[PDB]
From a paper:
Flavin-binding fluorescent proteins (FbFPs), engineered from prokaryotic and eukaryotic light, oxygen, voltage (LOV) photoreceptors, are promising fluorescent reporter proteins. Their small size (about 10 kDa for monomeric FbFPs such as the improved LOV (iLOV) protein derived from Arabidopsis thaliana phototropin photoreceptors) and their oxygen-independent fluorescence make them ideal reporters to monitor transport and anaerobic biological processes. In contrast to GFP-like fluorescent reporter proteins, whose absorption and fluorescence maxima can be tuned by exchanging certain chromophore-constituting amino acids, the absorption and fluorescence of FbFPs and other flavoproteins depends on noncovalently bound flavins, whose structure cannot be influenced by mutation. Using spectroscopy, X-ray crystallography, and quantum mechanics molecular mechanics calculations, we provide a firm structural and functional understanding of spectral tuning in FbFPs.
Author numbering:
A (entry chain A): 48 to 153
B (entry chain B): 48 to 151
The structure:
């Protein structure tokens, strides 16, 4: 099961929804992540150039796929196969972003 | 502002999330729609051909846009400029569907 996050499009893309697999993968309950930017999943071993490519894609509302080192709540690393896409209305306004997280550590 | 719905991919695509604008447009609170298929928004004057196109698109996980007649909680009809797309993982498994609703 892949984790899924939904964020607001604007401000700092706060998380507005996670699926159950999100909590299985990351160790966080919904109430611990709602209203936060997903960057709290990163740590000192996360690749800064990868974070930069996500930052620039989100600012432009461009879809992006990266493999990124992330951390469970208890501190265990997992390699996150992350896919992020904007949700657009028919005028092209960005309504939200959706993220799909696959734990590809094994 | 455009309404947004997120559903599960499987079974009968039950609604798992709605934004604030969904409630403004439809007059339903989240508690009233969570766990339900969004077809409850349709009613007597809804075009059956339009429903059938949405049904086939969801079954194949194909993106689709339709203008569909829907009904607010209080029974007032409204034109829903609806666009539906699947959310996929990187192996192409469908994880969810996203619907965007504009009252036109
Ligand atoms: C919908 C969505 C989901 C995201 N999921 C993750 C994630 O699972 N792991 C992660 O490291 N970053 C994730 N991000 C990226 C961070 O939120 C952030 O955009 C990234 O760290 C780049 O921005 P920054 O330099 O301001 O931190 C996600 C962003 C969005 C919009
Ligand atoms: C994410 C999502 C959002 C939807 N939103 C609406 C909507 O706003 N109004 C509507 O009439 N149908 C909506 N539908 C369509 C119905 O849920 C259903 O797929 C359609 O009526 C055709 O299938 P049926 O013949 O089994 O009812 C949505 C479906 C999905 C998957």
């Amino acid at each position: 099961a892949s984790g899924m996050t939904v964020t607001d499009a604007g401000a700092d893309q706060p998380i507005v929804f996670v699926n159950r697999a999100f909590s299985t993968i990351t160790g966080y309950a919904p109430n611990e992540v709602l209203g936060r930017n997903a960057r709290f999943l990163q740590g000192p071993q996360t690749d800064a150039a990868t974070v930069a490519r996500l930052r620039e894609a989100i600012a432009a509302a461009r879809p992006i796929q990266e493999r990124i080192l992330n951390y469970r709540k208890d501190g265990q690393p997992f390699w996150n196969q992350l896919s992020i896409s904007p949700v657009r209305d028919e005028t092209g306004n960005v309504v939200a972003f959706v993220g799909v997280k696959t734990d590809v550590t094994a």
